[PDB]
Amino acid sequence: SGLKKFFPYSTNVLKGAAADIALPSLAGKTVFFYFSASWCPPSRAFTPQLIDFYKAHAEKKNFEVMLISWDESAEDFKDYYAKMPWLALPFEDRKGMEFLTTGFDVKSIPTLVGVEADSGNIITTQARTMVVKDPEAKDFPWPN
Numbered sequence: 001s002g003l004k005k006f007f008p009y010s011t012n013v014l015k016g017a018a019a020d021i022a023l024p025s026l027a028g029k030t031v032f033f034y035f036s037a038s039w040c041p042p043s044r045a046f047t048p049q050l051i052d053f054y055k056a057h058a059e060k061k062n063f064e065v066m067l068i069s070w071d072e073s074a075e076d077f078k079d080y081y082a083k084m085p086w087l088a089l090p091f092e093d094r095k096g097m098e099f100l101t102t103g104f105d106v107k108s109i110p111t112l113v114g115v116e117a118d119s120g121n122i123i124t125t126q127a128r129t130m131v132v133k134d135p136e137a138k139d140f141p142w143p144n
């Protein structure tokens with residue numbers, strides 16, 4: 001996996017209440033790293049739009065979303081991630097969050113960066129705006 005250079009400290013990611021998801025289940029997909037936090041109103045307001053997009057398109061367009069949390073506390077993470085249907089980098093992997101923030105040049109939230117799982121190549125850094133501008137995914141994955 002292609003993405004293994006982006007997970008130095010977590011071998012499993014979250015889905016719902018579990019922590020049994022491994023990286024091979026992302027083979028062949030585009031993976032969107034979603035930088036967000038509940039303390040940020042703009043981020044909170046973008047999340048539902050991304051939820052509708054995910055329900056409409058995740059299967060047909062073969063993508064996954066992974067929350068990379070800038071939340072303030074373990075409790076805030078738990079409550080905010082519980083609103084989401086997709087994956088998350090575990091909160092206790094703070095170092096891994098900082099690694100990805102630096103690696104994808106994330107200076108603000110919400111930010112959504114799409115990567116090809118098999119190569120690890122960044123495909124798009126504009127997915128936040130394009131989920132809003134292209135809600136039917138006509139031009140997905142919006143390659144930069």
Ligand SMILES: *SC[C@H](NC(=O)CC[C@H](N)C(=O)O)C(=O)NCC(=O)NCCCNCCCCN
Pocket residue numbers: 039040041042043107108109110
């Ligand atoms: S809620 C957190 C904030 N996000 C926004 O305000 C939303 C931005 C935009 N309208 C959008 O909707 O995407 C956020 O992520 N703030 C963090 C941040 O931007 N810090 C970077 C500050 C860098 N300042 C540079 C100063 C250099 C001067 N020489």
